[PDB]
């Protein structure tokens, strides 16, 4: 019954850290390779 409640709070930031870092493999074709690259293309 540890005070992991305040730890989970940090984890909330961690989950985003994990995402923001490796989520580029997905987000890459969300706007970059699906908008920004197009507008710059034609």
Swiss-Prot record:
It is found in: Secreted. GO terms for biological process: defense response to bacterium; defense response to fungus; innate immune response; killing of cells of another organism; xenobiotic metabolic process. Has antimicrobial activity against most Gram-positive and Gram-negative bacteria, filamentous fungi and yeasts tested. Has trypanolytic effect on T.b.rhodesiense and limited hemolytic activity against bovine red blood cells. It comes from Stomoxys calcitrans (Stable fly). Constitutively expressed in the adult anterior midgut; proventriculus, thoracic and reservoir regions. The chain holds residues 25 to 66 of 67 of the full protein. Keywords: Amidation, Antibiotic, Antimicrobial, Fungicide, Immunity, Innate immunity, Secreted, Signal. It comes from the Eukaryota. This is Stomoxyn. GO terms for cellular component: extracellular region. The modification Threonine amide is found at residue 42.
